[PDB]
Ligand binder design. Sequence first.
Ligand code: PUB
Ligand code: PUB
Ligand code: PUB
Ligand code: PUB
Ligand code: PUB
Ligand code: PUB
Ligand code: PUB
Ligand code: PUB
Lengths: 186, 164, 234, 176, 176
Amino acid sequence: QVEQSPSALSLHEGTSSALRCNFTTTTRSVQWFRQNSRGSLINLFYLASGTKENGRLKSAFDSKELYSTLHIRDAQLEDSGTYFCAAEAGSFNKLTFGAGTRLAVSPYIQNPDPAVYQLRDSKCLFTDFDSQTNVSSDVYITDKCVLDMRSMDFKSNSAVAWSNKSDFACANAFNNSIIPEDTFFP
Amino acid sequence: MKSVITTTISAADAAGRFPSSSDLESVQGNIQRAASRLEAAEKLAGNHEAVVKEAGDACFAKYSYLKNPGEAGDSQEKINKCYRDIDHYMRLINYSLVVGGTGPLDEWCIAGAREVYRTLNLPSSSYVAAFVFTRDRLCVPRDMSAQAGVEYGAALDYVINSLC
Amino acid sequence: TAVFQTPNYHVTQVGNEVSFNCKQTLGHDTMYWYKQDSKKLLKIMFSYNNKQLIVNETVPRRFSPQSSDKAHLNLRIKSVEPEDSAVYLCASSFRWVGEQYFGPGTRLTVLEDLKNVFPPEVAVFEPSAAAASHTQKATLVCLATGFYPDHVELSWWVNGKEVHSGVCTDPQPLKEQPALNDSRYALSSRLRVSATFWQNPFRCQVQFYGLSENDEWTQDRAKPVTQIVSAEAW
Amino acid sequence: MLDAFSRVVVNSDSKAAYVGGSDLQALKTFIADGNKRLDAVNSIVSNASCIVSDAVSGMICENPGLIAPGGNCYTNRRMAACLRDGEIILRYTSYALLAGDSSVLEDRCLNGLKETYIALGVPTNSSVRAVSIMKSAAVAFISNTASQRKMATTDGDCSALSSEVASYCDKVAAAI
Amino acid sequence: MLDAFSRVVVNSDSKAAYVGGSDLQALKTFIADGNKRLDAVNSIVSNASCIVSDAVSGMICENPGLIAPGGNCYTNRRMAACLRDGEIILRYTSYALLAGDSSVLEDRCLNGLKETYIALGVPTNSSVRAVSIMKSAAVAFISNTASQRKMATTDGDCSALSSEVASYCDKVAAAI
Ligand SMILES: *CCC1=C(C)C(=O)NC1Cc1[nH]c(/C=C2\N=C(C[C@H]3NC(=O)C(CC)=C3C)C(C)=C2CCC(=O)O)c(CCC(=O)O)c1C
Ligand SMILES: *CCC1=C(C)C(=O)NC1Cc1[nH]c(/C=C2\N=C(C[C@H]3NC(=O)C(CC)=C3C)C(C)=C2CCC(=O)O)c(CCC(=O)O)c1C
Ligand SMILES: *[C@H](C)C1=C(C)C(=O)N[C@@H]1Cc1[nH]c(/C=C2\N=C(C[C@H]3NC(=O)C(CC)=C3C)C(C)=C2CCC(=O)O)c(CCC(=O)O)c1C
Ligand SMILES: *[C@H](C)C1=C(C)C(=O)N[C@H]1Cc1[nH]c(/C=C2\N=C(C[C@H]3NC(=O)C(CC)=C3C)C(C)=C2CCC(=O)O)c(CCC(=O)O)c1C
Ligand SMILES: *[C@H](C)C1=C(C)C(=O)N[C@H]1Cc1[nH]c(/C=C2\N=C(C[C@H]3NC(=O)C(CC)=C3C)C(C)=C2CCC(=O)O)c(CCC(=O)O)c1C
Ligand SMILES: *[C@H](C)C1=C(C)[C@@H](CC2=N/C(=C\c3[nH]c(C[C@@H]4NC(=O)C(C)=C4[C@H](*)C)c(C)c3CCC(=O)O)C(CCC(=O)O)=C2C)NC1=O
Ligand SMILES: *[C@H](C)C1=C(C)[C@@H](CC2=N/C(=C\c3[nH]c(C[C@@H]4NC(=O)C(C)=C4[C@H](*)C)c(C)c3CCC(=O)O)C(CCC(=O)O)=C2C)NC1=O
Ligand SMILES: CCC1=C(C)[C@@H](CC2=N/C(=C\c3[nH]c(CC4NC(=O)C(C)=C4CC)c(C)c3CCC(=O)O)C(CCC(=O)O)=C2C)NC1=O
């Protein structure tokens, strides 16, 4: 059918990368989409044996070689999503989709201040760490989340970890993970 | 609907005659050539969309100027109708191959066509481009048998010759 | 203009019947139904030119799609089955030349037992004092806990104006009891503001999509219907 | 007029559809029985004079009032008129049979016939006794069960064809 | 057919009266606007192809069911039929306008048209959408307010003429 690579893609803010998509029968045209978080398919390109450019994206389609690529230049945080090629290959009556490429951009943190805070409940937040660190049975650890104040132009990776057991406190909450040695605990 | 059977019957009706040997031989010919025009007809019906789409692409490739403002391709709705018209013609060729004669082409698409196209500014050449492409594109034995190639190519030449 | 599609979410029990509607205000004449599996793979189910179905890709008999207008296409599924839970995407295009334009979709969960549907519990935490004294900035945290299916929409509302500035809701939810059949999910979000902004005396709101009047609730717990569950802080 | 294939094409067209695969196989069945159909037509037309004067003589046989003064087969001129009309109807049903469609029977022969007859004074209960006799004379010849004459054909079941020719004769008996 | 003067004469005749002085001065007004009338006619006929395919394309524009299977502009043969009918009606209303009387429009074109259409199956609500579009295409050209084409005439009020041509188009939209 339609084989799309790579299956997932973890790029730094700024990195450039490529997605390829190979077909097995003659293809009349190719459509590239990016699926946002709410699940709408955003149209990126529709092309027939050419090149097209659009912002930081660039796509190409060689009909005689049966391939199509998508290049992403200077990757920004707004570029994260699941990326799809559809080929009008076959009998030109339907679109065939590839498996997808899971693309996630992690921000470049100008100045990292790793720390683990605690939050008082109106009626543990491992914030401001560096993107080189990753995080991990009645302890609830969510995966890293990248927020951004577009007023202050300040990006921040934060993770959150909670439980109700009193035996567990913020001191060693993120213990199965590798926190940086410079982490500052109050 | 012009065809072996209809042509013969209405020759006899014009004469007050029951069917006779000429008439029965004529239908017998319809039996002999049946099996390859129905082959063309089924291959066409089974792949109509891809044929229509290559033909329309070939047309607008030959006459890129049609996509200019004021031409018959200056909007996506108009280009899409163009491929629609090509499909109408290929549907009628399907009919023509099934009936055995050019009847369906004759009444349903040839009749008003010069006046209609004169009036909506549709150059005759563009359809000729699309049918010539389809005709030359066909491949034996890949796409169909030899005597079905003959039938298919033939209906296409007929529709081409109605635009000259 | 766009492909519009209702409902966004839908939970029903095996044997009920569902019906999605799609319309399109583009100038178009072809409409499609695609089924996105849980592996993120789209397959076409149906295609329609004018009123005439032109593509039917061996969908079982339960799925039946009805078009009235060329700008409208509906799909009714009867005797809904458990493996039919997926995202149903309506698309639209010109038949012969053009790109397909997609609509928001309809997530359909098909539950064995209708009594597995719990709404969320939304709890707003308050910004750390250290944070104000060490980053000159205060960060809030919201938690939505113990809901099912993952059909939720989390937002942050500050004095009646929704704020997508400096907010980070987790991409995928967190299953509370993994390996315990259908676990209930939890979902955290963050709202970082400046220490000054918090200093001057927010609401974390979680919209949930559950059972509808088309479902029979004989349990003692309150009917888990579509609702907004919100927490506040000042 | 249409025939079997043109009729499939007109129906396909009302849906803007290329000819279904189901319809193609029906047509290849039509083609498979091509030669039986030709024998059917040959067995009617080779006996047309027999069939038409059988039927009209029979009509008069069962109701001699037709040939009493004031009956519609009274003078030689009216008798000959009726023989011509028998012959004409048989001709249009042999067109139908050779065509595979009743298109030409209905278009060129039955359209307004009921009115024409009402106008002339032509007894319609009698026309259809004649046509119903022609129906049996004809399906006899098709099925090769006619008493006083046989026609050497190969062994097969020609019953679908006979039913066809009887359905066209019934279209006539109904048009009036 | 009659024109403006013949029409005054037919009315005078029904009373056995020589042409009133009032009628003579009306006719000399007709004569005074002779040249505006000729410009009116010239501005329609010089654009007839524009007016007729504008109107028919528009009719189909607002109701695409006309060009779906079973609609009356479906084949090329029916589309061309409709274009001819648009052209014919426009021709008879340009005769009306040049004549000063609707005599020829009613006599040679509208008489039995409603029946003919009922017989053929020609949608009448659609014919009149086309005719009403032609009405506006035409009074535009007369009044020289057409968007994509002007025609150099001298400065004057041609409104009585436009109303005349619209009254003839309404006679058509009413005949069916
Ligand atoms: C109508 C059924 C008849 C009944 C009374 C029966 O028991 N046998 C019958 C007829 C019949 N004919 C065939 C096959 C043929 N018929 C042929 C003559 C017609 N084909 C022509 O081209 C011409 C006119 C020009 C005809 C009059 C022919 C040539 C054949 C094929 C070979 C042959 O039989 O000589 C069949 C079935 C036998 C078959 O192979 O189809 C039947 C039952
Ligand atoms: C229909 C009203 C028009 C509007 C759009 C307008 O603002 N000016 C208009 C037209 C108009 N024409 C005249 C006078 C003339 N028209 C002439 C041509 C026609 N007379 C002919 O013999 C021929 C055909 C053979 C004609 C096409 C002519 C020759 C005249 C008179 C002198 C001239 O204008 O060149 C008027 C009023 C001016 C007048 O003196 O009557 C108007 C308003
Ligand atoms: C294709 C080769 C052409 C080139 C030139 C191009 O650039 N466009 C076209 C096609 C085109 N067709 C229409 C509108 C009509 N086409 C008609 C013929 C069609 N209808 C039939 O039944 C069949 C045959 C049986 C044919 C082939 C007709 C009758 C019309 C008028 C009705 C309609 O569909 O609109 C257009 C639009 C022209 C315009 O000015 O709007 C175009 C561009
Ligand atoms: C015969 C079975 C009927 C019996 C019953 C009977 O008593 N009279 C019979 C038939 C008859 N038909 C006419 C005169 C006409 N028949 C006409 C129709 C046929 N002409 C055609 O071309 C066709 C085929 C399309 C048909 C079926 C027409 C027309 C006439 C009028 C012209 C004519 O030849 O008179 C008559 C004579 C009535 C009379 O007194 O003129 C009879 C007796
Ligand atoms: C055009 C605006 C109409 C729209 C509505 C539509 O869908 N079809 C339209 C027009 C149409 N007209 C015919 C056939 C005839 N029209 C006739 C009247 C005209 N012929 C004249 O000589 C004149 C002037 C005096 C008039 C106004 C007549 C008569 C016919 C029948 C002869 C013919 O050419 O068919 C048709 C075709 C209907 C069909 O299937 O044959 C259409 C589509
Ligand atoms: C008066 C009551 C009388 C007339 C004169 C006849 C009317 C009649 N014919 C029927 C059937 C029929 N006619 C033919 C043609 C005929 N038969 C031959 O073998 C040959 C040769 C000829 C030329 C004369 C045939 C083949 C048939 C077939 C049926 C049959 O039984 O022979 C008939 C029956 C109609 C019915 O089934 O209701 C009638 C009434 N017959 C008379 O008795
Ligand atoms: C689809 C909705 C659509 C079609 C294709 C048209 C139908 C339409 N035309 C109307 C008026 C009109 N047509 C012409 C001729 C045309 N205009 C030019 O300048 C020249 C040159 C031509 C040749 C193409 C004219 C002059 C007019 C005059 C009025 C105007 O607004 O231009 C019309 C209006 C009818 C009404 O007043 O109700 C319709 C609906 N238009 C379409 O939109
Ligand atoms: C009645 C409807 C009928 C048509 C007409 C054709 C039309 C047609 N041929 C194709 C496919 C096709 N056909 C040929 C031609 C070709 N190859 C040979 O070995 C010989 C010597 C040549 C005969 C001249 C080539 C070379 C290709 C592949 C090139 C390409 O598809 O781009 C394709 C593309 C779809 C596909 O790849 O299958 C189409 C649409 N198909 C039909 O069903």
